[PDB]
Amino acid sequence: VNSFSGYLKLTDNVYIKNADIVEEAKKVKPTVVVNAANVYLKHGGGVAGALNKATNNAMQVESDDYIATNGPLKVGGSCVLSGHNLAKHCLHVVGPNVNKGEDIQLLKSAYENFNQHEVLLAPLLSAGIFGADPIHSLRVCVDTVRTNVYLAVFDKNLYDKLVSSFL
Ligand SMILES: Cc1c[nH]c2ncnc(NCC3(O)CCC3)c12
Ligand SMILES: [Cl-]
């Protein structure tokens, strides 16, 4: 039993809700919140910009030190950093950004990072400003993640479309 409330159950391990991941994280304080990161951990917009703003830029400060030490992430890769005031940990996961020409096949590799954590709060990878089809992102999530994932979809119309179209 966990404290995630109001979710619709999609499969044995995948759950979904129309919610702002920022407001959800503040309420639940999950062990792991997933960020929709880029390889430079430049949290300018989309989910990343919103999560960073909620940390008063502390996420960005920590991220800049991480990059200065380790260099950029790989597309499809991840790193674990602090969750600041939002969660214990933030799993920064880089899905492919279609508006950069990146290979959508890397979306499965991106979701595989979730399997290293028993329970996560997360957005759909590569959706929104990363330019992929969110229906596809949900399909890859369900077919790749085996741990317990609570998906927050910010747009109500897209959520209803994701629910109504779910196979
Ligand atoms: C932009 C933003 C702020 N807070 C959020 N919480 C959850 N999801 C988000 N955007 C990603 C999508 O849900 C839309 C396509 C996939 C956001
Ligand atoms: Cl977005």
From Swiss-Prot:
It catalyses: Thiol-dependent hydrolysis of ester, thioester, amide, peptide and isopeptide bonds formed by the C-terminal Gly of ubiquitin (a 76-residue protein attached to proteins as an intracellular targeting signal). The chain holds residues 1025 to 1191 of 7096 of the full protein. Responsible for the cleavages located at the N-terminus of the replicase polyprotein. Participates together with nsp4 in the assembly of virally-induced cytoplasmic double-membrane vesicles necessary for viral replication. Antagonizes innate immune induction of type I interferon by blocking the phosphorylation, dimerization and subsequent nuclear translocation of host IRF3. Also prevents host NF-kappa-B signaling. In addition, PL-PRO possesses a deubiquitinating/deISGylating activity and processes both 'Lys-48'- and 'Lys-63'-linked polyubiquitin chains from cellular substrates. Residues 1-167 form the Macro domain. It is a multi-pass membrane protein. May form homohexamers. Interacts with N protein. Inhibited in vitro by GRL-0617. It is found in: Host endoplasmic reticulum membrane. Changing S164L: In strain: Gamma/P.1. This is Papain-like protease nsp3.
